[PDB]
Amino acid sequence: DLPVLLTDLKIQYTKIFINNEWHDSVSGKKFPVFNPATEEELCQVEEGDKEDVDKAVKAARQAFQIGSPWRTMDASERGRLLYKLADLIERDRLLLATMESMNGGKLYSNAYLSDLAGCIKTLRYCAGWADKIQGRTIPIDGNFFTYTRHEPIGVCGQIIPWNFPLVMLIWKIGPALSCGNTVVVKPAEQTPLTALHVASLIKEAGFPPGVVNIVPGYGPTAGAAISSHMDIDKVAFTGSTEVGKLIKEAAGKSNLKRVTLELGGKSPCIVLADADLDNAVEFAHHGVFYHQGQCCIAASRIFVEESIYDEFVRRSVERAKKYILGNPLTPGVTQGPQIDKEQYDKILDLIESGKKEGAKLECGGGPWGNKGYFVQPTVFSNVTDEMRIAKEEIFGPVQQIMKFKSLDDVIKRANNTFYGLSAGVFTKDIDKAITISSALQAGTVWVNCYGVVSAQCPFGGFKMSGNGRELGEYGFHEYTEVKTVTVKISQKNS
């Protein structure tokens, strides 16, 4: 069931959201926001800078003060507000999916059926945790009563990427709010719009002012302001590994603010000779090509055992030749554009290395169309490990297919990277499935599938693919700060 918006979308919310009201920028500057499919300007949005981040942090800090409505309300009521926010996003699902598609260059079918469904489900999941965050009573040595409080940390700075704007917004704000924090969100310069609509719904839902503040703008200005701020308690960032290093560095320099990072990858799949071949081809395909390759988990190195390698490449290539490029809003279209020029160039530049360094181009390998940042879906076979396309995150519709014959060696090759976000193992053998997934240095390991993400399980990177986890029970720990309270008593009893 794929319903659509009957009237044309109008952009309404374009301002900095602080204390549940709409603010002009302190400078009074604004910045344009584009459709990546047409290269046309959609609207202008107020440009937040350091001065605006400062207003946002003061609002967050006041909303966090002992005795405030957000600190004193029942945990169950924090949950209620979150479930209300989810109902409102559900009510505005058509509007949000359309805006997400138009601004993000994201296929509308996927925006509506996956992105918005995952947004609503993740919020509902997080709402349920709010009054289930618990500390401990602890049988300490000596005559003492010891308990712990898993408090909110405080003001959390949250920097959101452009590839899944709504999903990433909710992955940040859901847990942070469930645990009782206040937030200053900086959506991506490319994709501020859907977040600003969500902010209007945060107001409608009745969150106390200052609990969520959204400051659109650029990364080197507003993002740097967040990462170096002396009164932000924690920064959460999803994006490139390069920028992640700057975030962590700045946190260290400033006020030792807590850090979680969800970064890029060069995620490997290992396809054994006994694998269901079609299932492995289909999931490895979608594993690399989903959302024009603009997923941190992109299955960008597919190692296939020699005896099934040729047949894997053949079947893969024919699956890649089935796409229909164009406007993601038009039904039947199955591949939209890349987000912007910067990304578009890096993709094409990396495609050229594949050719020059001697990979076998099976299909694609150039641009498409008169407008929009479109790249033909590209498959390279006979890829080797020291090639640029096997080392660097492409973030584009570019599949690398490698051969192996030794399992020990292909595991070393899979692990031979500074990345470690995710990986895939395709086999019918129980022992292989368990032992290989244990040996892979990856945060999520999928077995006979790929790209299966859900609110109930933790998600994040090994190595330079991240610090910490988001979602699941485990991810909620990083939005709490633990206080131990130890009380002298005359005599304890067990």
Next chain:
Amino acid sequence: DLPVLLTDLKIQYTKIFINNEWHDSVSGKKFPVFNPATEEELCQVEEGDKEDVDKAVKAARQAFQIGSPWRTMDASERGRLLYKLADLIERDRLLLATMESMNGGKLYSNAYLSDLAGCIKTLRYCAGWADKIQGRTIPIDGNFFTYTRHEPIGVCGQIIPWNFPLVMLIWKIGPALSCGNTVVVKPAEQTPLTALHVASLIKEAGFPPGVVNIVPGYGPTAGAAISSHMDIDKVAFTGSTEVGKLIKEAAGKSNLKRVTLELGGKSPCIVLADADLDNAVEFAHHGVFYHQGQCCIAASRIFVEESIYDEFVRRSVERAKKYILGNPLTPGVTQGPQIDKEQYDKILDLIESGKKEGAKLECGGGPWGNKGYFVQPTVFSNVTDEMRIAKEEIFGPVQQIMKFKSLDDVIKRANNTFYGLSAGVFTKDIDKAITISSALQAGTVWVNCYGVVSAQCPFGGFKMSGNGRELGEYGFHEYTEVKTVTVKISQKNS
């Protein structure tokens, strides 16, 4: 019961410990180690540098490899090795306490009765966790079986301070080993000796080679090598907040290694008019003066309600005038020296600010003796908030006593610091105890006591007093890395 060593202590272990063997430094340089009470050289120890840290990390990495003895042994057996290590430390308790006293400038009674007891107890606590570290099975959306592995992270770099050398060594290695990590430990340049004895006991206990590697040396060389190493997965550091910022920065610059920091404080006590006055005086006293003030939790701002302030100061001062300074090995001695010159100067320099900025000197305020880094126990009353002695961590035997009359205001004053390691609340009122301890921005809040530390509860700082927690159930999380494994199945059932 205070037994002693019958023969004089001989120093035996003075070398870099890698792969369970004793190594000369790569350069071949050595550095002297001193008794702080006599200023005499005790011995020379091999000086580890970047080149030696590199040998230690390669050993740790090999011991961590899939299929190694440490990775494949039963969790219960990791526990057994840890409980064996504790039995060996218990066997060598006299030797270790004497060495700890002589090298650290630490009162022997405290070394034997508290430091060594806490070392043994913490190891035994950690041993019990080893086969109780568990992941989850998760009711993910869709037809999938999802489980998590709480794996060890890998090679953990661990930098240990000089104030509690043995206790801090065990606080690091106990949890890291219980969870299955391998470690490269850099004990403090001032106090390498007790760690090198523990390393001999790690060998005796039968830990596989490379699981624990100890590299003595200086902070700016060996410590920097650890913090910037591209194949260390995690750094744990206890020390100054200043150096903590350098550690976190370097982690960001290098390989985004995971970070936990246990840093300094300017920890406040709030003494209400209804408090048991003598109990508050005794705990606030020991809270600031323990181990010559060289505790990160030093209760270095004591706020007392006006109506009991004069009587609190009087009783405090007379308690401070009861000390006997000298060699910590001599029975009856109740105050040893500061660790070294650098610390000694900072202490005296800060004592001079108290005088010049107009605090009331009640006793002390100068040095003591012909040898040793001794400082007279010092009490200042009528201390105000903008004084250096109320803002800066002294790390010396220097008590600050402040007056207050408003509870709201004294809580703001208590929280008005970038620090937040711990705090104390003294009152008989149930509501005051709970509400004040909730409102304090401190990692541990003691009620009608101070400095009660135990293996069963988590310990660490709010704000710039730390990132993360050590010990308790909660502290064990930061020595694991969580992997989600999601397996496609034909049909799930609840």
Next chain:
Amino acid sequence: DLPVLLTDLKIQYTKIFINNEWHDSVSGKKFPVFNPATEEELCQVEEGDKEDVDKAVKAARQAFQIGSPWRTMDASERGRLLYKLADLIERDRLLLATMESMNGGKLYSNAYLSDLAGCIKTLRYCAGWADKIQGRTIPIDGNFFTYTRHEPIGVCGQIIPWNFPLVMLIWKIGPALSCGNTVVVKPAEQTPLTALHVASLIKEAGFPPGVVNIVPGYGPTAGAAISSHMDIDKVAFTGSTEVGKLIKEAAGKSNLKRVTLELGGKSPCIVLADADLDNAVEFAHHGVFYHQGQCCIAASRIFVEESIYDEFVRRSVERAKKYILGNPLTPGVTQGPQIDKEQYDKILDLIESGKKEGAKLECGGGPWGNKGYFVQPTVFSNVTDEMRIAKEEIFGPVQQIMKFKSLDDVIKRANNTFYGLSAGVFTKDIDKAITISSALQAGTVWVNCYGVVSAQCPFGGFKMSGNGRELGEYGFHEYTEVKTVTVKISQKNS
């Protein structure tokens, strides 16, 4: 805000609810349901017997089969259905509160503001747990992968009392459904009506057929059928301790079905001389008199320290003399009737023992009105331990006030009972609050309050006041059955 129903209530649902359809009884018998305030017949309801319970269990068993919709749906979707049920109960809050008031003899203000609010909140709480029920991955000795599944148990028989019909229905079905069980509910013979309305809302919400089946009827017939059934996996019962013993016995005789029991009490309060006197009087008052004394937690022995005893009795008695008896639907009325004749007689019979055994009657002590099972609010002072009114659960508006002078002795006296559901401690002293609450053999201990129940914390009895806990995280364990799955592997790694 106390809104009311504008039209008169009409009874609609009067039949046995199996497989989401309305069934006549197998015999074809029906039984009358009365208003306790007027003694008038409200309607007739279909009388379930053993033959009907058998139809209900076959439906529950089929809905529980591997591959069924309830077993295969996402846990998150079980949660969604529960949150939907809560929205529907909220929509029908006026109707439900009126029906609850009219059938249960329950003050409408309390029905609407407390009972229905707690019903809605408990369901929403339980909904949030559904996809957060998790097993473990376990570092077993040897080369094995071990995980656990916290499965639903299966068909759960649930017997609901008459004192809080809606709240008790939801306390049973919320957790049992959240965990994935199917249920056969037997509401009290006195109060079947509100449950049958909830069943219509279970249908409307879209729960698969057979997941909830409701069989009204009598205890000795339908309740016994449930407790002895050979294909019911678990029985949950709230009611008298006497019947609880029969339930547990029958479970043993039949198929060793799992048992949880929430039974009666003779719950004590200990009021120390330093207590806030008015707060202690107010909470102890409401602690015994709430819902005409028909609470399992009734604070039916109030021990007050000698020096404040007279003043406690005086203030208590004047609070008890403020009630307005009558129809619970009429505004201004502050005390409704007892549920039925059986209860009414036991209450009056026990009031007579108080008089005959020599308690001091301060007020009340007889019946009220021309119709309805009304008992005057009664206060006895100078009650002693071997009196019937100090040993037996009255379940009526009858307060017992005792004196004590020794704390050790009053704790023994408080604990000197086969009961142990709850207790109260009133004092300003931190140490007394902690030590007394630790020493009381009671499932819930309130400090400076009484009767504070919430979905987030576990609730149940020590001793013959119950087996197991309901609600909180802990209560959810008893609606799961744990399966260990141990898989042979070639080699494990930590």
Next chain:
Amino acid sequence: DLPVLLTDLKIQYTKIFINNEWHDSVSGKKFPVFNPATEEELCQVEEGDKEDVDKAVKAARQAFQIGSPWRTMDASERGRLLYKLADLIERDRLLLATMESMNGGKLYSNAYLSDLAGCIKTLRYCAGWADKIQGRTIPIDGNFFTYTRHEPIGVCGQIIPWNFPLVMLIWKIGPALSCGNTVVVKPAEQTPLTALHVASLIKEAGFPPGVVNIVPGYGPTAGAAISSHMDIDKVAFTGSTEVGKLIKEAAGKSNLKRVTLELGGKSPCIVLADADLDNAVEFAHHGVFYHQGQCCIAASRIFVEESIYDEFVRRSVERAKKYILGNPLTPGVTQGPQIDKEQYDKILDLIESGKKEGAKLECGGGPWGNKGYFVQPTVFSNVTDEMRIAKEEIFGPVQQIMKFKSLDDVIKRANNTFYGLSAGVFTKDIDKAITISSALQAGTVWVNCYGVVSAQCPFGGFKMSGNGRELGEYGFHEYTEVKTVTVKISQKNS
């Protein structure tokens, strides 16, 4: 490495152990204890009856009193005592294994290498939990501070079977003591001796008097006294399902004491056509034949897919023909006797039903020797579901092998029993392994193995094979009683 005792074993401890001293029976009666291999009397032991159980419960109750040494000692110290007990059992491993072999009819190699190793390991596991039992702090609605205490329950009655006397003793006392309970243990009438030696080691280790009391004697006298006692808080029983029903019934009749039951089974294995055939044969073999078939988990129905059935039967039969019967103390002996006459008769009687009801006798099927309760190892093929040997627990060395061709049907057949202790699944297919183990109504499901038991994972039965779980984290819950403490406060903050 199989070492032995150099001198002959002498029996020393033969008396009732209460308050850490040795008691004659109240009557003054004694009962004989036999070697099952020779039918010779080993010694006489003091016969505990109801009057002796009463002395034991009064001792347990006093040791449990608030303020006692056991209630007030550090949790860590309960752990220490347990680890000390394990060291003492390790010291006496030869003595204990010999006594266990001689009294229990248990192969000495298995007694020494498995039973004693598992005893020591389980105790060490349990010791580690003692100071890691924790309650919660809970974000309750309203202005309250709520925490929970996971208290010990109190006096726990523990009834131990004869098949694994030491292992079962430690499975009971380890968790119960770790959690802070006191115990009254009734070892099996057949095998009291090893428990009485352990009691001497409990004294030596320094457990406070009354914490462990051991009352040897018969089941219908001392066991019934335990199950019906009005001051025992909990009964734990391992044995027949028949007696389990009597225990649960008596608990209900008496004081609603908490119950856990570990009962018998008729545990199925499902061997798929793709299974490693030799591995399935070897584990299914040991799964049924271990300890002369006297395991509650006996794999007593082996369903094998038709196409590999004949080859499975052939290989199974030849494995069964390899045994050497005799005295379990003699090296080379690989099968000892059944425990006693009662068991011996039931086994032979059930073997006769197999023959008369038309099973194919492949080997065995009669007694062996001139003395001792020896039964030839017996294999039946072509067993059908309504045969006595496929329905009733034999508890003897008697294997049943069945054929199947439909997976759906064989799962129904596997689940078609009132039992549900364990099961086995043998296959190479990932999906089959997960889906079949989910669908089996069994507490432990082994995949490509059988009889893998370890301290780290919970163990117990579905259906009439048990109530509750022992060991693992989960099993520790049933030795705690949860208390909720809810404290009124002026204002809460998250």
